[PDB]
């Protein structure tokens, strides 16, 4: 059996040409709405939340860690480096790298976070340590966004990523300062205006991280504070059959619009 919410999401998927994954957690009474909730999707840059969070976790015992400068060499630059390119032969702190990765989708910044954790496996080990049994990071930037159909590398499920985002931002997977810092970074994101945020009431406060990759992969994960009610977590993953497909942020906005009904 399916609910009207799931039926609407299925109709959206049908019109879209692609494969849509949605997970909503309503923290008022811990209810969930899932659509392909246990299917794997390429995370693309939504994985940057796990990498930044892992570094935040490290800073709970190394309390000056976020202040540590990291060198940026010309050789470090990859395919999308809006902030890191300002610091070639210079430095960015781990805080600055986190902000750039999360708020500007900077891929060089993500590679520095991955390196700080000892490689993609270090990010995965953090995921396991906070109870995410589904997340896997296998590669660095930019290849972690290849989003090849059937490829299990650099994937997770909408249900798992929603649970993790809830634990990181509303729960206590992180220390108190670290949780607040992650929320601050997500709230100030610059890349999300056409995605989940575009489908929600404008009075609602939103923190999000988008994802983009090949096969027209278009993602967004958000923590949401609706008007006068307990917060929500929403994951919207979308990927398409054609390697060269264009982005479809409108599909994420439409999914958010459906999900917001009644909340």
What are residue 93's DSSP bridge partners? Answer: 69
Say which residues have a Cβ less than 8 Å from residue 204's Cβ, sequence separation at least 6. Answer: 224, 225, 226, 227, 260
The answer to whether 226 and 19 are in contact (CB under 8 A) is no
Structure tokens at 6: 């799931």
Return the closest-CA partner of residue 167 out of 156, 178, 157. 178
Phi, psi of 27 (to 5 degrees): -80, -5
Q: Would you call 138 exposed, middle or buried from its count of C-beta atoms within 10 A (0-12, 13-18, 19+)?
A: middle
CA–CA separation, 78 vs 215, rounded Å? 20
Number of domains in the chain: 1
Buried b (16+ CB within 10 A) or exposed e, 69-101: ebebeeebebebbebbeebeeeebebbbbbbbb
Structural domain harbouring 107: 1-263
Q: What is the dihedral of CA 237, 184, 132, 130, to 10 degrees?
A: 180
Instruction: Give Rg (Cα) of the chain.
Output: 17
User: Which among 22, 34, 12, 80 is positioned nearest to 221, based on CA atoms?
Assistant: 22
Identify which of 251, 241, 216 has the alpha carbon closest to the alpha carbon of residue 149.
241
How far the first Cα of the chain sits from its last, in Å, is 22
DSSP string for the chain:
---HHHHHHHHHHHHHSSEEEEEEEETTTTEEEEESTTS-EE-GGGHHHHHHHHHHHHTTTSTTGGG-EEEE-GGG--S--TTGGGGTTEEEEHHHHHHHHHHH--HHHHHHHHHHTTSHHHHHHHHHHTT-SS------TTGGG---TT--TTEE-HHHHHHHHHHHHTSSSS-HHHHHHHHHHHHT-SS-TTTHHHHS-TTSEEEEEEEEETTTEEEEEEEEE-TTS--EEEEEEEE-SSTTPPP-HHHHHHHHHHHTTT-
Q: Which residue from 48, 58, 54 is spatially nearest to 127, judged by alpha carbons? A: 54
User: Which residues does residue 218 pair with via DSSP β-bridges, in sequence order?
Assistant: 212, 238
- CATH number for the domain including 168? 3.40.710.10
Cα separations in angstroms, 235 against 20, 57, 223? 10, 22, 9
Which candidate, 67, 15, 3, 39, places its Cα nearest to that of 149?
A: 39
The number of CA neighbours under 13 Å toward the Cβ of 5 is 18
> For 53, what's the count of Cα atoms within 13 Å in the CB-facing half-sphere?
32
Measured in angstroms, the resolution is 1.6
Q: Report whether 172 contacts 159 (CB < 8 A).
A: no
- Identify the experimental approach: X-ray
């Amino acid at each position: 059996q399916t609910s009207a919410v799931q039926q609407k999401l299925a109709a959206l998927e049908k019109s879209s040409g692609g494969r849509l994954g949605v997970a909503l957690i309503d923290t008022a009474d811990n209810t969930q709405v899932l659509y392909r909730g246990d299917e794997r999707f390429p995370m693309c840059g939504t994985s940057k939340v796990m990498a930044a969070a892992a570094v935040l976790k490290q800073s709970e015992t190394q309390k000056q860690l976020l202040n540590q400068p990291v060198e940026i060499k010309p050789a470090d630059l990859v395919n999308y480096n809006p902030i890191a390119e300002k610091h070639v032969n210079g430095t960015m702190t781990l805080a600055e790298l986190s902000a750039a990765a999360l708020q500007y989708s900077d891929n060089t910044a993500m590679n520095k976070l991955i390196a700080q954790l000892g490689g993609p496996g270090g990010v995965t080990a953090f995921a396991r340590a906070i109870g995410d049994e589904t997340f896997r990071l296998d590669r660095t930037e930019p290849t972690l966004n290849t989003a090849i159909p059937g490829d299990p590398r650099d994937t997770t499920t909408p249900r798992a990523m929603a649970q993790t985002l809830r634990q990181l931002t509303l729960g206590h997977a992180l220390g108190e300062t670290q949780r607040a810092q992650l929320v601050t970074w997500l709230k100030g994101n610059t890349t999300g205006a056409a995605s989940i945020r575009a489908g929600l009431p404008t009075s609602w406060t939103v923190g999000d991280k988008t994802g983009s990759g090949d096969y027209g992969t278009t993602n967004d994960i958000a923590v949401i504070w609706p008007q006068g009610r307990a917060p929500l977590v929403l994951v919207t993953y979308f990927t398409q059959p054609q390697q060269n497909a264009e982005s479809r942020r409108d599909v994420l906005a439409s999914a958010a619009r459906i999900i917001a009904e009644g909340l």
